[PDB]
Design a protein around this ligand. Structure first.
Ligand SMILES: N[C@@H](CCC(=O)O)C(=O)O
Ligand SMILES: N[C@@H](CCC(=O)O)C(=O)O
Ligand SMILES: N[C@@H](CCC(=O)O)C(=O)O
Ligand SMILES: N[C@@H](CCC(=O)O)C(=O)O
Ligand SMILES: [Mg+2]
Ligand SMILES: [Mg+2]
Ligand SMILES: [Mg+2]
Ligand SMILES: [Mg+2]
Lengths: 252, 252
């Protein structure tokens, strides 16, 4: 498989998932229909998303690692799938929720060759391949903010901070893209519990780096060795090269 | 003027403001074109919104209190107008920004008879009148959550909190409506600076109360005497009547 296949596949998936969710009323979306392999409830909105995405992905030779159904398939190409990221928003009809896909040539993030995040409520399309990073067909890049007085997405603020704005939109995959396109100056998930799973962050990290951002773990460590498995967990500190080390200091 | 006139007027305004913003590219939206009477800069997105709104409102016998141009007109009916609430989101193409209108028979919020918040990115319509509170024509009401382990919109978290979720979307008028329709269990603006202006909150507070929520200042004082002027500022604690006192305690 190559980055063209992955774009094609991701778009087909985006199409079907969007259709499926859009036809499900909010009262159905919000129903708890099962337990996911990740250890959190699967809502009806999650199940329909994942079913639609897997219908397409299983026709391919990949190992899929996805939130509700866990690990599936046997291909040498690994795909990290969040069939619905921002499920709470989707259940409330709040326009920030996405399907997220990251394709890698091994079970480690350093081998990612394609990343794709699609806002299911608005139609906004983010992806990145070897040619750069895109939002709705147009090249994007991270902001050049250097001061701590910047616009931050942060999970979660638990002390006074120097930021100009703090926002928390409820979909990490999309919010990483809000960072990737310059909307926000940084994305921080510093929750001590280390809550992000590989399928939450992977596409967002790949897109953000291709947009020029520096994206690391809590302590500046590379994310390259994060595994595409259900056990993997992440903290993220992401910002342009100038701002990144300042934030690392700040959150010490 | 009555509540039906206000619905009509608000819808006409929503239509034109939506048109005006939609046709304006993000690179133009974000331009700083002037200073607002509020004391914050006026973005070109703000200006085109306010102009479209005032074109319609001036044709009415009202006193308008609006962010960019301040206090206008002479009528006995006061209208608090945020022509564009969530301007930052609108400049980045993040789908949470709104026009907000609150109509009152005096210059105090206790005399409000109509409130209206319209998401310019999605077309979502919130309003409340004597018949109740609505979202896209459907009656809404606040959530029945009783525990501090709830879903919270809070500006800004600065300590450890017991919430299940914390979100900050960047449009106070809309976020009060997220509270009003039950999507979130509470809305909290407890920023010590007391930042919210009357046009940010008025419509949201009226809609939230009509939806059954309890909405007060920091200390539980009624918001009834808040003035429709440029000097007015607000903190807000809003939740159902069961949860509300617990939150008052939590931040005490
Ligand atoms: N909304 C599109 C997503 C991909 C695209 O065509 O840009 C679809 O129907 O698949
Ligand atoms: N129309 C978009 C999403 C829905 C919308 O337009 O709001 C799409 O085809 O994906
Ligand atoms: N007020 C909405 C339309 C609602 C309606 O008239 O049914 C708009 O013009 O943006
Ligand atoms: N502002 C457009 C958004 C388009 C859409 O989300 O369908 C509306 O009237 O709804
Ligand atoms: Mg789950
Ligand atoms: Mg999910
Ligand atoms: Mg201003
Ligand atoms: Mg404004």
């Amino acid at each position: 498989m190559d980055e063209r296949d992955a774009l094609r596949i991701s778009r087909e998936i985006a199409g079907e998932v969007r259709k499926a969710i859009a036809s499900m009323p909010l009262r159905e979306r919000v129903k708890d229909v099962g337990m996911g392999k990740d250890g959190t409830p699967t809502k009806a909105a999650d199940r329909v998303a994942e079913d639609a995405a897997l219908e397409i992905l299983r026709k391919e030779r990949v190992t899929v690692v996805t939130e509700e159904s866990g690990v599936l398939g046997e291909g040498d190409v690994f795909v990290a799938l969040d069939p619905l990221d921002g499920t709470f928003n989707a259940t409330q009809g709040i326009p920030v929720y996405s399907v997220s896909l990251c394709f890698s040539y091994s079970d480690k993030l350093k081998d990612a060759f394609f990343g794709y995040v699609y806002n299911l409520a608005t139609g906004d399309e983010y992806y990145a391949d070897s040619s750069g990073a895109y939002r709705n067909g147009e090249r994007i890049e991270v902001s050049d903010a250097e001061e701590l007085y910047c616009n931050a997405i942060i999970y979660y603020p638990d002390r006074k901070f120097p930021f100009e704005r703090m926002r928390i939109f409820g979909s990490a995959a999309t919010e990483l893209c809000f960072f990737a396109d310059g909307s926000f100056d940084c994305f921080l998930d510093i929750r001590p519990g280390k809550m992000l799973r590989i399928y939450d962050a992977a596409a967002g990290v790949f897109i953000a780096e291709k947009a020029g951002g520096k994206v690391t773990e809590l302590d500046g460590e590379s994310l390259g060795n994060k595994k595409f498995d259900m056990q993997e967990r992440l903290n993220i500190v992401a910002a342009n090269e100038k701002l990144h080390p300042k934030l690392l200091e700040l959150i010490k």
